[PDB]
């Protein structure tokens, strides 16, 4: 795995010693090269995970996420070039280093074999994210958003730390392989119930769950474009990955303890999508759509059926790409109009046609237009829930309807109607912005061709 | 104060602590504590100020009461055992009294009250000495008597220390008072594992010493005692305030910084002893410490407060004083988590 | 110089002599005090310090070449003369900058006295800068809060130093001051109001001269008397050294003072008291931009000796 | 309340200095090179070559192997009359049922 980790580390000295005119260029080049190298990990075995060493391993769950992170870094740099263009060289290098550190941490999280190592790194991801949000945010709510995000995540994580150490003391090892081979069923004792809660709540906080999702709107809206990209593309999937890993030692208590969270998420998807319907901020709308799409994954993980897990992995990858793209488009519009009010800018389709096409394709992916991987994951989760209970189809179909409604509503309000007259600073789309949108869309549509790669280890 | 005299007084404080850590006789340990107090009062009042005099008086009163109770406990143990060695105390009442006295010397709540006041009154150098070096001797005595320490009493004091430190730190604006309350909380963390594993207490003590050294030295380098005075630092020296941000995050304990090591190992040892509720509450309450650390980091470096016109003149001149240890202390207090297996060396 | 040197035996009192004396020449605007101060220094062998200017700190550091006003001072005396009631706060900002410059000057002078042993003659001092601020407040040029902040800054800084042994006051009447200013030719000086000069004179004679008289001798001289430098020097020589707190000081206190004056940042530590007055307060964006500009200046990016851009070499082994 | 610079005017459109901008930086040459780097590595390499690499990625999921083994097993099962799939994933002989 060091074939990916070591170059990622070597990015930092390069960025620090790169010329002020070559910082972005060098970073983008070598980040793309690192993504190319990470592509090799997709060759997962049929049964055994790719155990590179005692500390790092990968499976058909970890590899897509690793590729996603290594691919997301260059696009984040490209997006960050615009607003961080009047910054001093040292601070620009600092931002690049924060992004690189975040990518390195995420790689190690997705490859860590030891559960406590995963906890350490997955909670280490907070520091770069917090710094990015609080320092390079544009509004005054950035400080409160960072506080909310950090405190939510820590309040979830600390009981998880206690529980993990308890497991290490009792079982003797926290290695995923040993934990899976030496799995022992949990009883219904209150101690086991609280252990299950401690092991689940942290990941429930990580991937916004209705009731504990209050941090996400603030974080996504206040954070800079790159920060929002990671927040909505990988940092949320951290919760899903950790939950799928930790559910191995949380059975059969999951059957009894899932009902609260299952109902919370099944109603939360509807609630959040309805909230999207009546939103005035573009980034807030995108964030709430993310909340709903992640609630789908939460349901899938809780049900613990093989189809559910496959759909969960596919949905995670698809949502990462789509949400990052949506935030990038909103960022371009925001940079041009210097406001996040959705109704402020209207009829942008006339002024910017190609960006409007990008908007259309992104919204289509958001509403899970067949045969996009978004639809593949959503349909798999829907079928798994239908097997769990036939009544689920009601809420699932209603959520699909509301998602389509609010996505098309966003497209109509922004990229349709009479153009706003006073807004005269809408210049033609830059090549960089179009390239960013293309590098978000094309991989997803290509992934639809060979979904087996992103269908998880249960394929 | 003449520099030779000051060096002699500092060496006397160190010698008192060394005697406490070197002696095998209870009387000599008490003598070492008395020497520490005697040589500490003038150091606290090196810069003659009414606030400094008040701080010295309060410190003397508290430490004197602690020494009285300590000697009383020693005498009771002598009465019921005829022993002077620093071993298992053979009288429970003497054990309780000695625990109270040593906690008062440390500053564990509910004997925490004097710590913020004295810390605010004294200078940054005196504050550094008070919050780092003065914590060694009582902790050493506690470590030697850990077997006899009543777990219930010590755990109650430690948990209350953590809670009260967090709460007090939330309300403070003066940097010294924030540091003092954080010190109270960290001492609670240190003493929580004292009945279970002393080596973990030593580890936490060392990490705390490094972190507090780094923080106090950065404050001295920036010559700031309030949140706004520290806020002005970004204009002159951004490096100092950014490193302060890093150290504050470590003090909060957020991984992968050094501050995670002590909390991680403490939770490990407490869970090994079948205690799960206590460490969970400890971490959840340390979140408050993290909160006030984050507020300070916000004001210092994460955000930029307005500056003054006179800062331009200060820009031209460069700091003459050079604290040699500061870089190494910053490194050791930020990036040492990959080095936990070195815990064995402490044993 | 440090604690070690004092331990080694370096004692300031050994170097200090009867000649070693801080003499401050004060007066109203264009009183010719500078000429008399130079004459006193020459005829006493003391080191004369030219009156602290806006770019005094620029002279002390770097290459001595005055830096840009936007980068060093952000205040104009000429603007104050033209518009004394500007909405930019130039009046109080200028006064505070002048006080900081004079605080640095006094420290620079004391350091010279405690290292070389040679006496110092200074044109006014911190103990005298209050006169101009009081005059501005009387004229209504500055607001009361500015005066309050100036008092705050002074009380936390000036106390650490020792008042001058000799206070020479060149008493020139306001009409003669006006005549000289008209002869001077400077249009900004010509714009100076007579009431401002009268306020300066009143502040001097009613506050400064009595308070200094309590501390030490105040050799008040008329313009004609000041012309006779020999008499002025003689009178200073015949002043009892008992006047002033210096006879009450010793090697320990002198060591403290010498350590204080060496660290210029410590000297100016309280000049940036975190009181947010609109006149002095500089916004974060402007602060960052100006500091970045200052750092770009050659010789300011790195510590002295490590700025290769100026010609420093061997940095790899420095 | 504070002497601060007036809000910076709307970000200068990079088209203003150079009509051919491509975004990225301000220097036209570095803009050209940044666009070349992003397009070449981003589209020509990863998106094309890596897609081909993952397209012809050797089958280590044992899909074809599974199908071939299933074919062999079906042949044997039908030839010997054995049921195509048994009712026990493990032999009952080695299961010491309580």
């Amino acid at each position: 795995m060091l074939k990916i980790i070591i170059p990622t580390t070597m990015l930092l000295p390069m960025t620090w010693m790169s010329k002020h005119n070559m910082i972005w260029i060098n970073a983008t080049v070598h980040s793309l090269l690192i993504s190319l190298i990470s592509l090799s990990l997709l060759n997962q075995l049929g049964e055994n995970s790719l155990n590179f060493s005692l500390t790092f391993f990968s499976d058909s769950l970890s590899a897509p996420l690793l590729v996603l992170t290594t691919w997301l870094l260059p696009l984040m740099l490209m997006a960050s070039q615009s607003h961080l263009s009047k910054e001093t060289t040292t601070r620009k290098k600092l931002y690049i280093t924060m992004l690189i550190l975040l990518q390195l941490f995420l790689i190690m999280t997705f490859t860590a074999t030891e559960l406590i190592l995963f906890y350490i790194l997955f909670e280490a991801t907070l520091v770069p994210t917090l710094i990015i949000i609080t320092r390079w945010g544009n509004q005054t709510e950035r400080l409160n958003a960072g506080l909310y995000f950090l405190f939510y995540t820590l309040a979830g994580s600390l009981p998880l730390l206690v529980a993990l150490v308890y497991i290490q003391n009792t079982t003797g090892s926290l290695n995923f392989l040993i934990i899976h081979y030496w799995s022992h069923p949990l009883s219904n004792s209150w101690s086991n119930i609280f252990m299950w809660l401690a092991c689940i709540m942290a990941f429930m906080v990580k991937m916004p769950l209705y009731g504990l999702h209050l941090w996400l709107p603030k974080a996504h809206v206040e954070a800079p474009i790159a920060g929002s990209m990671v927040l909505a593309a990988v940092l949320l999937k951290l919760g899903g990955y950790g939950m799928m890993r930790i559910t191995t030692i949380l059975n059969p208590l999951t059957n009894y303890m899932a009902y609260p969270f299952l109902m919370l998420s099944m109603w939360g998807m509807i609630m959040t999508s309805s909230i999207c319907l009546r939103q005035t901020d573009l980034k807030s709308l995108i964030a709430y759509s993310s909340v709903s799409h992640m609630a789908l994954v939460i349901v899938a993980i809780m049900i613990q059926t093989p189809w559910s897990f496959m759909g969960a992995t596919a949905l995670m990858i698809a949502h990462g790409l789509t949400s990052s793209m949506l935030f990038c488009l909103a960022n371009t519009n925001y940079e041009r109009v210097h406001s996040r009010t959705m109704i402020l800018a209207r009829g942008l389709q006339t002024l910017l046609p190609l960006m409007a096409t990008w908007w259309l394709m992104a919204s289509l992916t958001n509403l899970a237009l067949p045969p996009s991987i978004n639809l593949i994951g959503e349909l798999f989760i829907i079928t798994a829930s239908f097997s769990w209970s036939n009544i689920t189809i009601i809420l699932m179909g209603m959520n699909m309807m509301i998602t389509a409604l609010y996505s098309l509503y966003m497209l109509i309000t922004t990229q349709r109607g009479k153009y706003t007259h006073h807004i005269n600073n809408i210049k033609a789309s830059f090549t960089r912005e179009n390239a960013l949108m293309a590098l978000h869309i094309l991989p997803l549509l290509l992934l639809t061709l060979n979904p087996k790669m992103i269908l998880g280890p249960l394929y | 104060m003449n520099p030779i005299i000051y060096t002699t007084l500092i060496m006397t404080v160190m010698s008192g602590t060394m005697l406490v850590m070197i002696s095998s006789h209870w009387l000599l340990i008490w003598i070492g504590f008395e020497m520490n107090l005697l040589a500490m009062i003038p150091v606290l009042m090196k810069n003659f100020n009414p606030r400094a005099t008040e701080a010295a008086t309060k410190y003397f009163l508290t430490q004197a009461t602690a020494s009285m109770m300590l000697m009383m406990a020693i005498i009771i143990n002598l009465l019921y055992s005829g022993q002077w060695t620093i071993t298992k105390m053979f009288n429970p009442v003497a054990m309780t009294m000695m625990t109270m006295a040593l906690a008062m010397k440390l500053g564990l709540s509910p004997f925490h009250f004097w710590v913020p006041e004295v810390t605010q009154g004294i200078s940054l150098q005196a504050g550094l000495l008070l919050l780092t070096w003065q914590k060694l001797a009582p902790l050493s005595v506690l470590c030697q008597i850990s077997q006899s320490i009543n777990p219930n009493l010590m755990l109650t004091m430690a948990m209350l220390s953590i809670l009260i430190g967090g709460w007090g730190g939330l309300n403070q604006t003066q940097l010294r008072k924030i540091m003092a309350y954080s010190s109270i909380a960290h001492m609670g963390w240190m003493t929580a594992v004292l009945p279970y594993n002393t080596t973990m207490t030593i580890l936490n003590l060392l990490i705390y010493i490094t972190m507090t050294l780094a923080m106090f030295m950065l404050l001295i380098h920036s010559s700031a005692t309030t949140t706004l005075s520290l806020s002005h630092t970004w204009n002159k020296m951004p490096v100092i305030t950014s490193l302060m941000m890093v150290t504050l995050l470590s003090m909060g304990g957020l991984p992968p910084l050094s501050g995670f090591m002590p909390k991680w190992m403490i939770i490990q040892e407490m869970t090994k002893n079948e205690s799960i509720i206590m460490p969970t509450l400890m971490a959840m309450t340390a979140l408050l410490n993290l909160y006030f650390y984050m507020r300070l980091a916000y004001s210092s470096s994460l955000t930029m407060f307005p500056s003054t016109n006179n800062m331009k003149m200060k820009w031209q001149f460069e700091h003459t004083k050079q604290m040699k240890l500061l870089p190494t202390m910053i490194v050791l207090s930020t990036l040492v988590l990959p080095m936990t297996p070195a815990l064995s060396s402490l044993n | 110089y440090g604690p070690l040197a004092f331990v080694l035996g370096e004692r300031t009192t050994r170097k200090l002599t009867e000649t070693s004396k801080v003499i401050t020449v004060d007066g109203n605007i264009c009183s010719g005090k500078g000429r008399l101060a130079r004459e006193i220094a020459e005829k006493l062998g003391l080191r004369h310090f030219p009156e602290a200017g806006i770019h005094y700190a620029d002279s002390t550091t770097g290459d001595g070449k005055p830096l840009d006003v936007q980068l060093s001072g952000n205040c104009s005396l000429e603007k104050f003369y033209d518009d004394p009631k500007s909405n930019d706060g130039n009046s109080y900002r200028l006064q505070s900058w002048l006080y900081a410059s004079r605080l640095l000057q006094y420290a620079d002078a004391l350091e010279h006295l405690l290292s070389t042993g040679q006496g110092v003659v200074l044109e006014r001092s911190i103990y005298s800068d209050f006169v101009f601020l009081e005059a501005m407040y009387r004229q209504g040029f500055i607001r009361k809060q500015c005066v309050e902040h100036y008092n705050e800054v002074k009380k936390v800084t000036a106390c650490e130093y020792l008042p001058p042994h000799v206070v020479v006051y060149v008493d020139v009447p306001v009409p003669e001051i006006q005549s000289r200013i008209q002869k001077k030719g400077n249009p900004h000086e010509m714009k100076i109001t007579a009431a401002y000069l009268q306020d300066i004179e009143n502040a001097y004679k009613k506050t400064f001269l009595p308070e200094m008289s309590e501390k030490c001798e105040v050799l008040q001289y008329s313009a004609r008397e000041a012309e006779d430098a020999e008499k002025v020097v003689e009178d200073i020589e015949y002043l009892k050294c008992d006047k002033g707190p210096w006879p009450d000081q010793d090697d320990r206190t002198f060591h403290r003072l010498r350590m204080l004056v060496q660290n210029k940042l410590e000297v100016l530590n309280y000049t940036t008291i975190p009181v947010y007055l609109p006149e002095i307060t500089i916004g974060a964006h402007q602060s960052d931009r100006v500091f970045q500009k200052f750092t770009e200046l050659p010789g300011r990016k790195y510590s002295p000796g490590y700025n290769e851009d100026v010609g420093d070499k061997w940095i790899w082994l420095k | 309340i504070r002497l601060q610079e007036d809000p910076d005017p709307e970000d200068e459109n990079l088209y203003e200095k150079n009509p051919d901008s491509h975004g990225y930086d301000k220097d036209p040459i570095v803009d050209l090179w940044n666009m070349r780097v992003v397009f070449f590595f981003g589209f020509s390499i990863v998106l094309v070559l890596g897609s081909t690499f993952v397209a012809y990625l050797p089958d280590y999921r044992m899909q074809e192997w599974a199908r071939r083994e299933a074919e062999r097993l079906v042949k044997y099962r039908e030839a010997n009359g054995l049921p195509l799939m048994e009712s026990n994933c493990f032999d009952p002989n080695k299961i010491q049922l309580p």
Partner: peptide
């Protein structure tokens, strides 16, 4: 077109 940076009022709360 500038990130919000604390004014005098924000610092005064501290």
């Amino acid at each position: 077109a500038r990130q919000w940076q604390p004014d005098v009022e924000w610092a005064e709360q501290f």
